[PDB]
Amino acid sequence: XXXXXXXXXXXXXXXXXXXXXXXXXXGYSMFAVGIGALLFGYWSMMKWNRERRRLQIEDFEARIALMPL
Amino acid sequence: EEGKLVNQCALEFFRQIKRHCAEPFTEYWTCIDYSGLQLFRRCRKQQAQFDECVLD
Numbered sequence: 001x002x003x004x005x006x007x008x009x010x011x012x013x014x015x016x017x018x019x020x021x022x023x024x025x026x027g028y029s030m031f032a033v034g035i036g037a038l039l040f041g042y043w044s045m046m047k048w049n050r051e052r053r054r055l056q057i058e059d060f061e062a063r064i065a066l067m068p069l
Numbered sequence: 070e071e072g073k074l075v076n077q078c079a080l081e082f083f084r085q086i087k088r089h090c091a092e093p094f095t096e097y098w099t100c101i102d103y104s105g106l107q108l109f110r111r112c113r114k115q116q117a118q119f120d121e122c123v124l125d
Contacts, residue, residue: 055109062108
C-alpha cells in the first residue's frame with residue numbers, strides 16, 4: 001500500500017471576504033450626540049457660574065463690612 | 070476721634086456672641102480655618118447651626 005499526502009479543503013477558508021463594515025456610527029446620528037453634548041455642556045457650566053455669583057458678591061461684601069481693618 | 074468709636078463698638082459686637090450662643094460660633098470658626106480661602110464653600114452645612122441660635 002502507498003501512503004502519500006492527502007488532500008483536504010473542507011470549507012475552502014472563504015476566498016476573499018470583506019471584514020470592513022460600518023459600525024456604531026452612522027453619520028447624522030453622531031452629530032445629534034456630538035452637538036447635543038455641547039448644548040448640555042454650556043447649560044450645566046453656566047448654572048455653576050450663577051452659583052459662583054452668590055459667593056462672589058458675598059466675598060466682596062466682607063471688605064465693605066470690615067472698616068476696623 | 071470717630072475711629073476711636075469704631076474699635077470700641079468692635080469689642081461690643083464680639084462680646085455679645087461670646088455671652089450667648091458660643092458653641093455654634095466656635096464650630097464655624099474651626100470650619101473656615103481648616104480649609105484655605107473658600108470662606109463659604111464646603112462650610113454651608115455648618116452655617117446652618119449658626120444664625121439659628123442668633124435668631125432667638
